[PDB]
Amino acid sequence: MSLKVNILGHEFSNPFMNAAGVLCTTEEDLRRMTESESGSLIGKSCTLAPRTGNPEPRYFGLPLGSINSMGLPNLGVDFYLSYAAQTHDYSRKPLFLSMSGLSVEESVEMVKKLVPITKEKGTILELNLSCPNVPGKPQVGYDFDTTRTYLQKVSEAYGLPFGVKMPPYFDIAHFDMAAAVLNDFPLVKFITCVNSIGNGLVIDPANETVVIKPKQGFGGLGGKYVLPTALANVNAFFRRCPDKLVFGCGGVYSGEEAFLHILAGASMVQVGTALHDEGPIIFARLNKELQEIMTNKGYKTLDEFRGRVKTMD
Amino acid sequence: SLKVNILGHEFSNPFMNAAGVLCTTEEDLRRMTESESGSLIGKSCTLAPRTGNPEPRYFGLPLGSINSMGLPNLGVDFYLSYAAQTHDYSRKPLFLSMSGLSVEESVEMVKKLVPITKEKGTILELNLSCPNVPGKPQVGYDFDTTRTYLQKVSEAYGLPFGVKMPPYFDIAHFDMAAAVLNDFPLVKFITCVNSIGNGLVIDPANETVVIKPKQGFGGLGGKYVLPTALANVNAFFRRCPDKLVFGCGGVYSGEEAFLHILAGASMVQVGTALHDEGPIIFARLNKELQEIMTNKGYKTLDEFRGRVKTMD
Numbered sequence: 001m002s003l004k005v006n007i008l009g010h011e012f013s014n015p016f017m018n019a020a021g022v023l024c025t026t027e028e029d030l031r032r033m034t035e036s037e038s039g040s041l042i043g044k045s046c047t048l049a050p051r052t053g054n055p056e057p058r059y060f061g062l063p064l065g066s067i068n069s070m071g072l073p074n075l076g077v078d079f080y081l082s083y084a085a086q087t088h089d090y091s092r093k094p095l096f097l098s099m100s101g102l103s104v105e106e107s108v109e110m111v112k113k114l115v116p117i118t119k120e121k122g123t124i125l126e127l128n129l130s131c132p133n134v135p136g137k138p139q140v141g142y143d144f145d146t147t148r149t150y151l152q153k154v155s156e157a158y159g160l161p162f163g164v165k166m167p168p169y170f171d172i173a174h175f176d177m178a179a180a181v182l183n184d185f186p187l188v189k190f191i192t193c194v195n196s197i198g199n200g201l202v203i204d205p206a207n208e209t210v211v212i213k214p215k216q217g218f219g220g221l222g223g224k225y226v227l228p229t230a231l232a233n234v235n236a237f238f239r240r241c242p243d244k245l246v247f248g249c250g251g252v253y254s255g256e257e258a259f260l261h262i263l264a265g266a267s268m269v270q271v272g273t274a275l276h277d278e279g280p281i282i283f284a285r286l287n288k289e290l291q292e293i294m295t296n297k298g299y300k301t302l303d304e305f306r307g308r309v310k311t312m313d
Numbered sequence: 314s315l316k317v318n319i320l321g322h323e324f325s326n327p328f329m330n331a332a333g334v335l336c337t338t339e340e341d342l343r344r345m346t347e348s349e350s351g352s353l354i355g356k357s358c359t360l361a362p363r364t365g366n367p368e369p370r371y372f373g374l375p376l377g378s379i380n381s382m383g384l385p386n387l388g389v390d391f392y393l394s395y396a397a398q399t400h401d402y403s404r405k406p407l408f409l410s411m412s413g414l415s416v417e418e419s420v421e422m423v424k425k426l427v428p429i430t431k432e433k434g435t436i437l438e439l440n441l442s443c444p445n446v447p448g449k450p451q452v453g454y455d456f457d458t459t460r461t462y463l464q465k466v467s468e469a470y471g472l473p474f475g476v477k478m479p480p481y482f483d484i485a486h487f488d489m490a491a492a493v494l495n496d497f498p499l500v501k502f503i504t505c506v507n508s509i510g511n512g513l514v515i516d517p518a519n520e521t522v523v524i525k526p527k528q529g530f531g532g533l534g535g536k537y538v539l540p541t542a543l544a545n546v547n548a549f550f551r552r553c554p555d556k557l558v559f560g561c562g563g564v565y566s567g568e569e570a571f572l573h574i575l576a577g578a579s580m581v582q583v584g585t586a587l588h589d590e591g592p593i594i595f596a597r598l599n600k601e602l603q604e605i606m607t608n609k610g611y612k613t614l615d616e617f618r619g620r621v622k623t624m625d
């Protein structure tokens with residue numbers, strides 16, 4: 001029996017990691033992720049400079065998930081690079097860093113700085129093209145021309161295998177158009193589906209007021225809200241992008257939901273909202289639960305069922 | 314108290330079915346008319362009868378619904394006859410949803426509707442957001458295609474109508490959509506929103522998708538879509554001040570209808586909850602919305618419509 005995953009020139013102990021932005025901003029966040037049972041971890045979407053973010057309250061927990069408009073609060077790219085260079089214990093697990101320039105030029109500058117550290121330590125890049133929460137900066141992945149520009153220039157500047165955090169799509173034509181762009185770039189080795197459902201609105205009936213301050217209450221949705229959307233996107237790209245891996249992100253609170261992500265095509269499985277609710281102890285539970293479901297169904301490895309979701313067509 | 318006075322009509326309350334739920338057959342429409350609902354709307358129809366997609370094509374879920382019906386309907390002639398000859402307009406006003414799979418089909422259909430709207434007052438909701446027909450993507454996600462539909466239908470129908478919009482998730486798309494809509498004055502109402510398109514639900518017991526069409530991909534409704542619906546309602550409420558907004562998505566109770574109205578909704582549509590519960594839900598919804606209004610001291614809907622507070 002094995003929850004192991006062998007991809008991207010690394011052996012992962014299990015397919016679980018945090019979703020970018022959850023429990024990965026500070027050194028202590030990252031130390032707690034490394035101490036956890038997670039197979040990996042990813043740093044907060046960083047910017048070239050430290051960034052303070054949107055006004056609070058900017059996160060609100062809901063019965064069916066979460067809404068956030070954090071606005072990319074982070075320590076700046078140099079902090080994450082130094083963590084990856086010196087601090088992170090790579091004998092424990094591999095490390096991803098998320099990078100989210102608000103422009104091509106900023107993302108290019110950060111990925112240039114990452115190059116020697118990836119060469120030195122094997123630090124993996126996830127490029128965020130789906131932040132829904134910075135006022136005036138719409139999700140890059142919803143503009144295919146802009147997406148193409150990012151992928152070209154980052155491919156050129158970084159020159160190493162990297163991944164992309166995609167926004168959810170809801171239109172078959174858009175799965176097709178997105179895949180075509182992505183398939184034009186061989187250094188994109190993984191596709192993370194998905195970021196939050198952008199620009200939802202939650203209102204408190206008692207005070208008749210939105211629950212978050214930024215953008216008149218409009219925020220990204222995660223948790224139970226996004227599971228069917230996340231699975232559709234993982235499978236859509238799994239089917240269209242034959243020479244890329246897909247990482248599943250959205251709605252994972254258990255081994256059984258992790259199992260569904262893997263069935264849909266997911267290599268790794270990212271946990272956001274549930275981890276925010278529960279803390280890093282969640283990873284021990286998730287391993288146990290996924291192992292148990294496999295045992296019940298007679299599966300011994302993840303690749304015995306990855307992408308094996310059954311259709312009736 | 315719950316009354317709504319819009320579009321040349323008085324409605325007893327803001328509630329109606331969502332297009333496609335309990336509104337395909339004459340018996341469906343009879344039961345909607347007999348219900349406590351303020352209005353009702355016909356199934357999105359096509360010029361010819363449609364059998365729709367293979368089964369299973371609806372699956373009910375703890376947090377809502379997934380569907381890929383494929384516009385199964387009795388054909389435009391039936392809905393037009395229902396509107397001209399059968400429907401009791403003393404009970405409540407009637408909407409018809411039209412969902413031509415091309416502009417040419419939509420133009421043909423709305424032309425037939427003209428005399429019936431003039432004589433009986435039947436209201437058009439033009440469906441621009443079906444996510445369930447293969448090779449025919451949501452028109453509302455292409456602002457060029459959307460402008461052409463709106464132009465040719467404006468010319469062909471020439472009377473006040475509304476549009477069923479897909480949900481948008483990008484402020485840039487709120488801005489673009491509203492700008493396209495604001496170029497057509499005959500568009501008097503905007504229904505936000507249609508199902509969240511092309512989600513995928515898989516049963517872990519059998520490792521199998523739950524609906525047959527399109528490898529399991531269908532539209533999501535119910536509890537999944539409430540924040541998306543509320544956001545879309547309010548986005549268009551703010552961007553289209555000379556139009557009305559209908560709310561649709563995630564309404565299972567008076568509290569959720571209150572939120573839709575607070576976000577900007579004039580009428581409130583009920584899909585999934587109604588599929589679950591049946592037309593008796595409308596009597597519950599009227600009672601719950603009243604209870605919330607009395608607790609807050611509102612005597613009318615316009616005392617709070619669109620008055621959601623923000624902190625910025």
Ligand SMILES: Cc1cc2nc3c(=O)[nH]c(=O)nc-3n(C[C@H](O)[C@H](O)[C@H](O)COP(=O)(O)O)c2cc1C
Pocket residue numbers: 019020021022044045059066068070072098128165194195196221222223224226249250251252270271272273274276
């Ligand atoms: C508090 C908060 C902060 C987040 N920050 C980031 C971010 O830095 N970069 C990113 O790609 N996604 C970010 N996300 C989105 C998550 O990575 C994930 O895509 C989303 O929450 C869906 O997963 P979930 O259902 O497990 O929450 C954030 C989510 C939340 C809840």
Ligand SMILES: Cc1cc2nc3c(=O)[nH]c(=O)nc-3n(C[C@H](O)[C@H](O)[C@H](O)COP(=O)(O)O)c2cc1C
Pocket residue numbers: 331332333334356357371378380382384410440477506507508533534535536538561562563564582583584585586588
């Ligand atoms: C069974 C099914 C059939 C539907 N058919 C139509 C349709 O004919 N036309 C339309 O505009 N919307 C149709 N819808 C979408 C609903 O009208 C509504 O926009 C969506 O389900 C979200 O509302 P809800 O959360 O109350 O279900 C259908 C939905 C379902 C559940």
Ligand SMILES: O=C(O)c1cc(=O)[nH]c(=O)[nH]1
Pocket residue numbers: 021045068069070071072073128130131132133134195196220
């Ligand atoms: O920092 C954030 O606001 C943030 C970034 C992102 O990519 N996704 C998200 O939900 N929030």
Ligand SMILES: O=C(O)c1cc(=O)[nH]c(=O)[nH]1
Pocket residue numbers: 333357380381382383384385440442443444445507508532
């Ligand atoms: O008939 C359908 O499949 C259908 C049409 C529509 O507009 N929305 C929906 O959810 N289903």
Ligand SMILES: [Br-]
Pocket residue numbers: 135136137138484485
């Ligand atoms: Br914007």
Ligand SMILES: [Br-]
Pocket residue numbers: 170171172173444445449450451510511
């Ligand atoms: Br579609």
Ligand SMILES: [Br-]
Pocket residue numbers: 292293296297
């Ligand atoms: Br089991």
Ligand SMILES: [Br-]
Pocket residue numbers: 319320321473501
């Ligand atoms: Br009017």
Ligand SMILES: [Br-]
Pocket residue numbers: 172173447448449450
């Ligand atoms: Br299509």
Ligand SMILES: [Br-]
Pocket residue numbers: 480481482483486
């Ligand atoms: Br959108």
